[PDB]
Amino acid sequence: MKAILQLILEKRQEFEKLPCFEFVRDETISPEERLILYPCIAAFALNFRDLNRYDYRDDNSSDYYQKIINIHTQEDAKHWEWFLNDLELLGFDKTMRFSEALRFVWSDDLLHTRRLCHNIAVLSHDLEPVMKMVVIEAMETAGLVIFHALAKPGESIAKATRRKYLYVADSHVEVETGHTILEQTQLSSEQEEKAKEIVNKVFQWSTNLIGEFERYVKAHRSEKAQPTA
Amino acid sequence: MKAILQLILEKRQEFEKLPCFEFVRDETISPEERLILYPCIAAFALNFRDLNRYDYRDDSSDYYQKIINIHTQEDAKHWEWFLNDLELLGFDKTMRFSEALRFVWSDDLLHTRRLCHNIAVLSHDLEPVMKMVVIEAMETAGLVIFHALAKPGESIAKATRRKYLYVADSHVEVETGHITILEQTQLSSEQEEKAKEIVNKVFQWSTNLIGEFERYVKAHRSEKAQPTAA
Ligand SMILES: N[C@@H](Cc1c[nH]c2ccccc12)C(=O)O
Ligand SMILES: N[C@@H](Cc1c[nH]c2ccccc12)C(=O)O
Ligand SMILES: [Fe+2]
Numbered sequence A: 001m002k003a004i005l006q007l008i009l010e011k012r013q014e015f016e017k018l019p020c021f022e023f024v025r026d027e028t029i030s031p032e033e034r035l036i037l038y039p040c041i042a043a044f045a046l047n048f049r050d051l052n053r054y055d056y057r058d059d060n061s062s063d064y065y066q067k068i069i070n071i072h073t074q075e076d077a078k079h080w081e082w083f084l085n086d087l088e089l090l091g092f093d094k095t096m097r098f099s100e101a102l103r104f105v106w107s108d109d110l111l112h113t114r115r116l117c118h119n120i121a122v123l124s125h126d127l128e129p130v131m132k133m134v135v136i137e138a139m140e141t142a143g144l145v146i147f148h149a150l151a152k153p154g155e156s157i158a159k160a161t162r163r164k165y166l167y168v169a170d171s172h173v174e175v176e177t178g179h180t181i182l183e184q185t186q187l188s189s190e191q192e193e194k195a196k197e198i199v200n201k202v203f204q205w206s207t208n209l210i211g212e213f214e215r216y217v218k219a220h221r222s223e224k225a226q227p228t229a
Numbered sequence B: 001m002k003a004i005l006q007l008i009l010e011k012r013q014e015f016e017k018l019p020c021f022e023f024v025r026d027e028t029i030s031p032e033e034r035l036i037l038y039p040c041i042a043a044f045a046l047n048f049r050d051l052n053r054y055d056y057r058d059d060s061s062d063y064y065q066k067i068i069n070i071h072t073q074e075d076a077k078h079w080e081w082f083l084n085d086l087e088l089l090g091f092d093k094t095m096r097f098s099e100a101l102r103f104v105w106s107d108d109l110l111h112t113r114r115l116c117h118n119i120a121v122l123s124h125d126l127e128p129v130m131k132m133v134v135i136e137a138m139e140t141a142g143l144v145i146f147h148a149l150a151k152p153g154e155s156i157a158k159a160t161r162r163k164y165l166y167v168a169d170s171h172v173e174v175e176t177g178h179i180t181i182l183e184q185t186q187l188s189s190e191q192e193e194k195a196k197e198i199v200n201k202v203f204q205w206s207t208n209l210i211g212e213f214e215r216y217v218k219a220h221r222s223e224k225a226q227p228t229a230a
């Protein structure tokens, strides 16, 4: 189990270095340009809400680990509204045809973004609570890397425009920083092998999402955020 | 297997009877009113495209998975027909990006939205002959739905002189020729019991989607289709 927690740090240290994040943290580039990837998260954020509401959560469970997951899911299932809040603030909540919105979400350029929650649902669907906690810890660690990064230009725009950002914001990183129990557990021989595969898959799928964000920024480099004071 | 194919026919006969289908077939109701449910299909039609491209399809060398892959290729095309008839019906409305997302992720379209999710979770570890059972049940549920929606659909298509592609006989026709190898297939005791489970879950999830369509019409009785003549 210490190995599993050490692999998660190893992957986070790799994950933290991706070009996307070097770009996002680059105070030499305007924060509006660094948040060009923002509308991309539309293919993920509400899927993530549903992963928490409908896939992770088991309300009827007595399992020690499942009751902790249930509390966690109740928090994480709230963040999609924060995504919609900042979409409007950043000027990305634009008038379009319904079909344009569907074609955007279901773009082949947002495949890995769109299917990250799907892959996690398939991975998790027959795991015991303890093994679900490994899935959630890895996923939560990747999320904290991304939002730590995105809160840099997010908080720069929030200060310059005198508006309260909720998603690409320190307040979002604060709740997810919380997201002392894995430490307090030891895995079967089989469980350790499954755990390593889980951590490897979640970071591989998260890196695939970040790869699409990077390509979108390049392909749509002019489509900067348009916040108003 | 003979039992499994007979359970799918029993399930179809029950599914055919749902109140939503009596409504969609009721020629005393304007077809514009009967297609109030059409935008609901936005939570399913592109998820179904992805189920076909990514979950069913395995681009293996097993004879059965090669048959599945052929099937998925046609089915992965119909989402475009959905977006064609969305525009013709006057449902391709201008709206905020967030309004589109809130619509697709509406709690009133939960079962519509998760149908494909549920089939992918059910399917992901199945051997090919059993994926074929999922596909055959799902194709049977679909044929019942499009047989019904093609009624108000072809009424509007004639009245306005426009080629409908999704709520249309041409969709029902490609589906009709879409089973030979399953009938030619021996399955074990275990496969038989798992085949039963698949057919029950595919029809109950399709029943839940159709229940949401019926509820949507009742919540949105003023939002009738607004087609224009050629
Ligand atoms: N905190 C993110 C969720 C998140 C967790 N893990 C992730 C990995 C990649 C992208 C997003 C995430 C949200 O509220 O929506
Ligand atoms: N014919 C539908 C596919 C379909 C199969 N089974 C279904 C069950 C419910 C709704 C739709 C379906 C389409 O092309 O999109
Ligand atoms: Fe979050």
Ligand SMILES: [Fe+2]
Residues within 6 Å of the ligand: B075, B078, B171, B175
């Ligand atoms: Fe179809």
Ligand code: NI
Residues within 6 Å of the ligand: A122, A125, A126, B121, B124, B125
């Ligand atoms: Ni499984």
